[PDB]
Amino acid sequence: KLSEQLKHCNGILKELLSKKHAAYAWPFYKPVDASALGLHDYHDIIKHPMDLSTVKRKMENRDYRDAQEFAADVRLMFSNCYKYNPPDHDVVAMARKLQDVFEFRYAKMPD
Numbered sequence: 001k002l003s004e005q006l007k008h009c010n011g012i013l014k015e016l017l018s019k020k021h022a023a024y025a026w027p028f029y030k031p032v033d034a035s036a037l038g039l040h041d042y043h044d045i046i047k048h049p050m051d052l053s054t055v056k057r058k059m060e061n062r063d064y065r066d067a068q069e070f071a072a073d074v075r076l077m078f079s080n081c082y083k084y085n086p087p088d089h090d091v092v093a094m095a096r097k098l099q100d101v102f103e104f105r106y107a108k109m110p111d
């Protein structure tokens with residue numbers, strides 16, 4: 001939502017939030033509510049929380065100046081998941097699948 005590359009980023013963001021990917025994207029829709037989920041060590045392990053609603057707010061507010069800055073937040077969101085959770089947890093399988101969607105479309109960035 002701005003430059004050509006940021007339009008491509010906004011397109012990816014809309015796809016990640018779309019019903020097409022909802023079966024595995026839903027844990028990433030909103031900030032992790034650590035207290036609600038009983039994850040009382042979450043904010044000791046994850047210094048920089050990130051989620052798709054925060055990425056959406058930042059895109060809407062024209063916070064991202066380029067595609068690289070947008071991608072860094074999306075990857076931070078996945079990295080937090082891989083850091084906090086055992087690699088055999090259901091949420092990690094969901095993260096892997098949504099990251100596959102992200103990486104393959106991000107690679108189609110217009111020059």
Ligand SMILES: CCNC(=O)c1ccc(OCc2ccccn2)c(-c2cn(C)nn2)c1
Pocket residue numbers: 027028032037039080081084085086089090091094
């Ligand atoms: C290391 C222990 N982890 C958790 O106890 C845990 C539980 C639910 C989560 O999210 C809701 C969710 C996801 C998938 C299936 C069912 N419920 C999470 C979680 C969510 N995110 C983004 N990262 N971890 C962790």
